[PDB]
Design a protein around this ligand. Structure first.
Ligand SMILES: NC(=O)c1ccc[n+]([C@@H]2O[C@H](COP(=O)([O-])OP(=O)(O)OC[C@H]3O[C@@H](n4cnc5c(N)ncnc54)[C@H](OP(=O)(O)O)[C@@H]3O)[C@@H](O)[C@H]2O)c1
Ligand SMILES: NC(=O)c1ccc[n+]([C@@H]2O[C@H](COP(=O)([O-])OP(=O)(O)OC[C@H]3O[C@@H](n4cnc5c(N)ncnc54)[C@H](OP(=O)(O)O)[C@@H]3O)[C@@H](O)[C@H]2O)c1
Ligand SMILES: NC(=O)c1ccc[n+]([C@@H]2O[C@H](COP(=O)([O-])OP(=O)(O)OC[C@H]3O[C@@H](n4cnc5c(N)ncnc54)[C@H](OP(=O)(O)O)[C@@H]3O)[C@@H](O)[C@H]2O)c1
Ligand SMILES: NC(=O)c1ccc[n+]([C@@H]2O[C@H](COP(=O)([O-])OP(=O)(O)OC[C@H]3O[C@@H](n4cnc5c(N)ncnc54)[C@H](OP(=O)(O)O)[C@@H]3O)[C@@H](O)[C@H]2O)c1
Lengths: 404, 404, 404, 404
């Protein structure tokens, strides 16, 4: 019976160790992700009622850990110490696959269970949830591993039972760890906002098709008989999108109207803007082989693309957005929005139901998680540096923890 | 049997006259609405299958006729002559009450029927409608009396049967003519976009509460047990909103952050903006008597207010907008939109179902059309000049045609 | 500091007493409700986390307590002792108004809060709820006060916080206690099953219009601009329905085709049945003043009426049922159901959201709880005997507990 | 230019012939389908506005033509002559693939277009449709080729443009003609009744899995990641269901509680019935590998199975039914229905949107039409005799018309 076990090792099934290895960010090393992370020994948090301790086999890589490593737009360690927190470190990571190792009171999962996690927490007793709100939209919702300490970049992780989903048996630990953040988010975007869900025959414009969200979105649209049109910044990435089932792709480099909308009273500026948007639209028609608009636009690029997305969406269509990679000003030409009765929908993460459904589709082989590269535990910094520099490969990445 | 009948007079019931009085805009008098309209004699258009000729008793006043009179943002007469049209005049008007006077083939309405109109046309055989689209959202939808010639500022008007709704018997001709454009639009905004419809207990932020849309919206929100908070620009208008059932009102003059959003990277500008939005939010809490956000925001003011509306809406809430009085740049802070999963919904006019439902509520006395002033046929110019100058009274206005 | 307080009295606010008065059913007095209940002193159950102790001011009367008193179709005390329960008595009651007197850990309500209860419990951690089920439909749902011991026929009652709703201030304790079981159930029936919810202009057939459910249903249908047609068994009861806003009423005594459906191959029997159903339908047309079918049928009478309800419902309409007063065989002629694409929907109780919404409408005066008679605590037996004998008055009844 | 062309031949593209070959039922040969049909020459009906004349390449086989051939439950020729019809024959057939040969006024399709038909007509100007009804549910809806004369058992057929859908290019004429009636109906059953549509992970009980509806249903359920459990009457048919993607199958011959429900007060009869239903339920659990209920039950067998279907459906689940092969008494135990809040939904045919969507899935290869046998034009009688005698093969059948 030991305080600390090496990675790959653990106390007897059913028992939590006092301490563990984890990858820590500290304020004194805020900056370039490559130098922000270091493996250290820390105390394992307590397992409360309704919680489990997971032996983490692999963990996913995420934009949010880049933010954490930089200390912007927020000093996570300081923001957390105000809440009354004692730790002067941050353990990130918001996707994982692993094995349930110990269980708290009231839990139905048993030690040995293979799980993947949806890295969202909420208060199941919240007033809004009680009166019918989807938990992920609760005032009490927060992102596990980013808005809270003790994420998945750790030998063991305490998770609430409701966060857990059955690991698809066909997947490696890395592949199972890499997908939930992007796949479940894309699934909620495309199928979570009635009555604007992808139907057979629907063209769907997918920004960043070769990226994490986009790679899952293309497969989902194809799977339901929709017509996925991907946007990319290289032929190589376009080819990846074709392999995933895209109808075709549009090279964003061939346009230069990207960015905020001019004042709608600036007639010359609007005419210039419209020229670019219409050129993009004609290219969309070309890829589609017909003069039709996308019924749904899968957004996340944000400021650069939102005006085009709004223009492109069909009458009674939806632009659904879960981020703003290029900036947070989403400039809408209200005329397109109201006259054609379009929906601009914000979306974030997924419900437990959605996490379970996308997991089912992945398990049955309808959808591939698109694992592109696997890192060792000592390479967490390198992995996030790649994302920081926009040099990460297409698809999703993973880090080995206890898995070999 | 005469070619032309004076206002108030008509051929025998069942028979269309060859000619009629109508209020005409001509290009040579484009400009100030007060001088744009003149009564002239014109040929009555043919009544085709599925159409009826209505003896117009009263007609509603509308922003769109101001646009028509100005010749901006479009020369309606020229835009229409390109389509191949022969007329060198425009007869506006997009709300009416009247009596069915003659019927085309296949029509179920009989002469004598008292009707009010939803001034929207669409092709009932349209591809999109056939595949399930709500007709008002069709690629084939257009506004009768504005996007088409021969509106309701005329002794008789040809309308398609599907545009017709039973006139509430309790209303004067003026009151029955004044309401459809605003009341049905507000009804679609508040009850037409599942799952974001007003429920008992929901706070609803209503811009322009004393205006046409707002006056109906406050009553509708109150009627279903929601909590209407009105925005106004005077105490007198606030008092009107209270009489309509508002919980309270906010004076927009007390804030100065109105307008487009700064670049989200401009930290000083954003902090200034947020200070104003939060001040507005605290005032909202005060009127409500509790720290809660509006679940639905009824928009139409547009550029000045949209950033505040987006900020204000509750998690999983909706900002629904049908115009842009102050401008067409709707600037969204994507962070508020996606992180709290908010919906920004464009809406326009109403479906026939919605027109019929709001008519039912008005008929049964649940909702008052808010007729504020009635004009004579020779005062159509004056009436629209008032709107042009923003000197029109609260509520909705009407013009007498054949009614005395 | 005393073990036991007389009705109307209590320990200091914030403190639970060791014992209390309650109205008990015991197996040795199973039978006629009038002799089944007796006031006794019992131990007050513990208040756990998330629970509160309510000082019960008044309690509602309910069919279910008749079942309990009879010992059919279930010996509640025996069924409960198998679960491992120790008590040899049953304290019924499934509606109450009262004052929060003591609170468990984690509760947001404070002592002094005036509440009414939705008498449904469920496990907020249930698997089905976690994956998106409405809690009232959970595998874990059960009726508080009937399927569990220690209901509201008691000086104090332990309730879970999620069961609580704010007592409308305008109502007496009796009126506030009498409504939730029927009003929230009717509200879920009529507004809870999208897309089949009552819209302005919809005719709605309401069985038992003068009864508990029906009295609320008529008001709700009228309130939203629907057209309520009530079924009754006397002119006096018809007149009550008119006062509540019914368009008119149908006397069920004038028909004799009630009951199970004949074999659909029995042509003479079907022709006889259809003759009665069509006669009922023509009477419906008469009350309505037009040849239209009800879009929604509010059911609960069950076996006698279901075949007629199914026949009557409009194309794409709904028959929604929450009980089977006359029997549990609901015989459907599948031809009417499939050819006209009708919905037969089972419904039970309400969600917390629905309980809160109907409470809001009652609070604002849109809906009256229809309190018909108030009893003293020693008359609980008499009150339920009335229901047993079908001699109870129209509307809803209540029993005073601590209220005077 | 000839009056009459042999099968396989036609006038020049764009031109309708005066006469055509067709397969006729006449009253004097009502009875066994094998002797009810005879090829004769008839006049081709006129092509009106919005209509097209299709050169029929192949036609589907259908239960409804058996009814027609028998003259029960209706003498179609007599029922139609009362409407004022002149013909003393009936040309059946309600599925077809073919080539548009001539077009009426206003039509967008061009001669040469390859189409399959949804054999439903409605009035696009109907009051109910105008106020929002799905056309297939209209008071004006009827089945083309059965409720109307001049179906697809004819060299040419007049169809309304809205009935037409693009023929999947990969399919033979026979395969394209065989699927719409069953595939679109099953698609509406499973995906047409929000919020009860098949989701990934949902078990679905499918009666008649090897049949027309069932064969499509199994594929659809599998495709969306649901778990299809088929009911069959032979091992051979079970094996077919496995090939289509079923999780497993249940042999209905192993149970004998099938049929109408006993009176719910008959305790011995109910206990016997429940024993059979529970045995069926345990077998369902076995096939599934877990103790779960089907969320959706795909019904059509009717009287024999409905009580079991209602018992089997999960809490808040749906039994959706489009026929009653075994009889029209659908006996519901209201206790299961209301206490567990289950939906019993009638469904018929499909909307145009649904026909187009299932066609898209078939075109893309997600779904196979399951063509089991193709007949010559002179074998229409034989084909329907097979169905009459329940000796037809699994899947769907077709008849060649102009195709070779
Ligand atoms: N729960 C959530 O809210 C949630 C979940 C997942 C992701 N997100 C957010 O969504 C965004 C995308 O995530 P991801 O995992 O898909 O990242 P990713 O793998 O980096 O993919 C994003 C892709 O967007 C494209 N892109 C970059 N700049 C662009 C521009 N100016 N215009 C158009 N496209 C551009 C790039 O592809 P090309 O260069 O080929 O165009 C890029 O690879 C991130 O901001 C992320 O934080 C949010
Ligand atoms: N089918 C459709 O799409 C449809 C239908 C109806 C209306 N609309 C559009 O909706 C808009 C409003 O229509 P309405 O009939 O209600 O007109 P209205 O009667 O003039 O009411 C609009 C009100 O908005 C308020 N307002 C004006 N400037 C504002 C600002 N800068 N910030 C905030 N509030 C301001 C004013 O009230 P206070 O000064 O008291 O704030 C004004 O009376 C118009 O642009 C109209 O064209 C569209
Ligand atoms: N959560 C739930 O599931 C829930 C909630 C509330 C009620 N329920 C159930 O719903 C049923 C009605 O409840 P309630 O509170 O409204 O009771 P109620 O006050 O007794 O009203 C029921 C009315 O139904 C009518 N009725 C009786 N026999 C009939 C017959 N053979 N045909 C047609 N109508 C008949 C009677 O009115 P006329 O004689 O005037 O026709 C009677 O007053 C009960 O079985 C109850 O248990 C269930
Ligand atoms: N638009 C519409 O409303 C529509 C559309 C299509 C079909 N339908 C109707 O739906 C029904 C089925 O159509 P289909 O095309 O699938 O016919 P089908 O190919 O004959 O399949 C029906 C299957 O049901 C099963 N069955 C027969 N008797 C049964 C019993 N007593 N209990 C349980 N299962 C039984 C049989 O399979 P096993 O012997 O292997 O169990 C049979 O092959 C027909 O009545 C048809 O008229 C309606």
């Amino acid at each position: 019976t030991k305080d600390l076990y090496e990675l790959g090792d653990a106390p007897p099934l059913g028992t939590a160790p006092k301490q563990m290895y984890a990858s820590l960010i500290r304020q004194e090393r805020y900056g370039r992700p490559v130098d922000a992370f270091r493996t250290e020994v820390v105390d394992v948090p307590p397992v409360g009622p309704g919680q489990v301790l997971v032996k983490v086999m692999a963990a996913g890589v995420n934009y949010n850990n880049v933010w954490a490593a930089l200390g912007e737009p927020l000093d996570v360690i300081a923001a957390r110490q105000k809440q009354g927190a004692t730790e002067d470190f941050h353990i990130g990571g918001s996707d994982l696959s692993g094995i349930v190792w110990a269980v708290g009171d009231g839990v139905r999962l048993k030690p040995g269970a293979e799980v993947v996690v949806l890295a969202c927490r909420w208060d199941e007793s919240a007033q809004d949830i009680r009166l019918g709100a989807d938990p992920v939209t609760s005032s009490t919702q927060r992102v596990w591993g980013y808005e809270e300490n003790y994420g998945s970049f750790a030998q063991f992780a305490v998770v609430d039972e409701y966060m857990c989903h059955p690991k698809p048996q066909r997947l490696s630990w890395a592949a199972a760890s890499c997908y939930m953040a992007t796949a479940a988010t894309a699934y909620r975007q495309l199928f979570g906002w009635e009555p604007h869900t992808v139907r057979p025959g629907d063209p769907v414009l997918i920004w960043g098709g070769a990226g994490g969200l986009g790679s899952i979105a293309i497969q989902l649209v194809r799977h339901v008989g929709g017509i996925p049109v991907a946007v990319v910044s290289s032929e190589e990435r376009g080819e990846f999108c074709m392999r995933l089932g895209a109808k075709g792709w549009i090279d964003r480099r061939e346009f230069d109207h990207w960015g905020r909308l001019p004042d709608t009273t600036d007639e010359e500026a609007m005419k210039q803007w419209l020229d670019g948007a219409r050129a993009f639209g004609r290219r969309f028609w070309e890829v589609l082989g017909e003069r039709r608009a996308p019924r749904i636009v899968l957004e996340h690029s944000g400021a650069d693309t939102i005006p085009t997305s709004i223009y492109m969406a069909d009458n009674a269509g939806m632009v659904v957005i879960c981020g703003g990679t290029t900036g947070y000003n989403g400039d809408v030409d209200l005329r397109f929005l109201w006259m054609r009765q379009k929906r601009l929908q914000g979306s974030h993460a997924a419900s437990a139901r959605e996490a379970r459904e996308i997991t089912r589709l992945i398990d049955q082989g309808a959808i591939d998680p698109c694992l592109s590269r696997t890192f060792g535990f000592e390479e967490i910094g390198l992995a996030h540096q790649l994302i920081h520099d926009n040099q990460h490969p297409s698809g999703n990445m993973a880090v080995l923890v206890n898995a070999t």
